[PDB]
Amino acid sequence: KVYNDGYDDDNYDYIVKNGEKWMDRYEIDSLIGKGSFGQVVKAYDRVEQEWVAIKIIKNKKAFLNQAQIEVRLLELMNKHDTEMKYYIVHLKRHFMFRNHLCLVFEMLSYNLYDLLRNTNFRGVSLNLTRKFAQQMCTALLFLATPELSIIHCDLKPENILLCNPKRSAIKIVDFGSSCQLGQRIYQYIQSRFYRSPEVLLGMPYDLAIDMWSLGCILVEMHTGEPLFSGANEVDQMNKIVEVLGIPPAHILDQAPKARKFFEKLPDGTWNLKKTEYKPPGTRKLHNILGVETGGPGGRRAGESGHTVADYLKFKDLILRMLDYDPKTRIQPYYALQHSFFK
Numbered sequence: 001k002v003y004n005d006g007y008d009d010d011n012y013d014y015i016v017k018n019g020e021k022w023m024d025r026y027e028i029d030s031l032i033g034k035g036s037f038g039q040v041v042k043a044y045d046r047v048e049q050e051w052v053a054i055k056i057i058k059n060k061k062a063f064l065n066q067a068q069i070e071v072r073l074l075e076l077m078n079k080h081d082t083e084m085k086y087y088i089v090h091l092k093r094h095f096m097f098r099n100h101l102c103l104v105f106e107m108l109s110y111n112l113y114d115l116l117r118n119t120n121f122r123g124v125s126l127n128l129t130r131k132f133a134q135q136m137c138t139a140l141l142f143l144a145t146p147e148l149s150i151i152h153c154d155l156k157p158e159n160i161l162l163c164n165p166k167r168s169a170i171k172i173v174d175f176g177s178s179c180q181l182g183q184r185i186y187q188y189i190q191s192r193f194y195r196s197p198e199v200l201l202g203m204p205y206d207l208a209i210d211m212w213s214l215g216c217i218l219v220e221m222h223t224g225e226p227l228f229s230g231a232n233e234v235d236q237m238n239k240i241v242e243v244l245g246i247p248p249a250h251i252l253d254q255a256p257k258a259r260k261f262f263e264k265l266p267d268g269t270w271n272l273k274k275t276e277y278k279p280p281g282t283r284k285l286h287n288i289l290g291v292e293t294g295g296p297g298g299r300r301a302g303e304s305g306h307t308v309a310d311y312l313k314f315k316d317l318i319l320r321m322l323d324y325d326p327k328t329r330i331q332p333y334y335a336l337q338h339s340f341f342k
């Protein structure tokens, strides 16, 4: 008949009403987001006198406990980034309201997927891509702080938002899938397009998987399309192989799930299993980027900052971010000193 005395639905979510006023403070405007966790709502904070984004968790033990883990990591990051200069979203406070946990985040603008949708998935400039890349590398450097050692674990364009609609400033959002460095508990992780080869191969992983995802994201911001748009793990691995070639022998020998995508021969070398795809390493990033042909689809020809010299610096940085080996894959600190950021 009713769930939580008529405040909830069958999905254990709060029935958001327009114009409702919680706790003589938050004035609820409208629903701005939906998810597995629950819902996200735009509201005016009458005490602080500002708009805020409130994430309302489902009235259910599982999501509550997972959200408290998120609350712990957000509050941990906030005490190390008190001046808010490392581009992580700010959890302002949290409260319980009619059995729902409510996280109050700051109000931000469009996500980077909405930005790509406005271009009809043709992408943004190398200059705007540089400003996003600088910011994400700074954010990843902050996550590498040894007391934090946080893996976001689900970096993608929809989890990167702009601060203001008329500025380039960004903040990373959604630490629900995030964890700190540790022993391996989880294996099916990250969104598929931005999923590192070590995750796909069932190998050990650390903070380098976020640098993989970043590499995939920065190409997508410029071209407009995902770099590796795999419909499944096999297709995902084959689309990586097209660009980067077959992974090294020493990695595949140490991979529990190598046989899912590859086939060891009598001589000891690894080929692809036939499931169609270009041969290994023949869909070059050089040609995807259009280094010499005026950028993606020749659309940047004649634009300032879109020369062969400029494109090579971006190309080089990305191939270091998309390094197959996570132990020699570029780190936030060195990535920030790359020629591309001069």
Ligand SMILES: CN1C(=O)[C@H]2CCC[C@H]2N(C2CCCC2)c2nc(Nc3ccc(C(N)=O)cc3)ncc21
Pocket (backbone or CB within 6 Å): 032, 033, 034, 040, 042, 053, 054, 055, 089, 105, 106, 107, 108, 109, 110, 111, 114, 161, 173, 174, 175
């Ligand atoms: C009005 N608006 C939107 O129109 C779009 C912008 C792209 C994503 C939309 N969202 C939420 C959709 C559900 C999760 C983010 C928005 N998020 C926020 N802030 C926010 C930041 C972090 C989190 C979180 N999950 O940690 C939630 C909300 N502020 C504004 C906002």
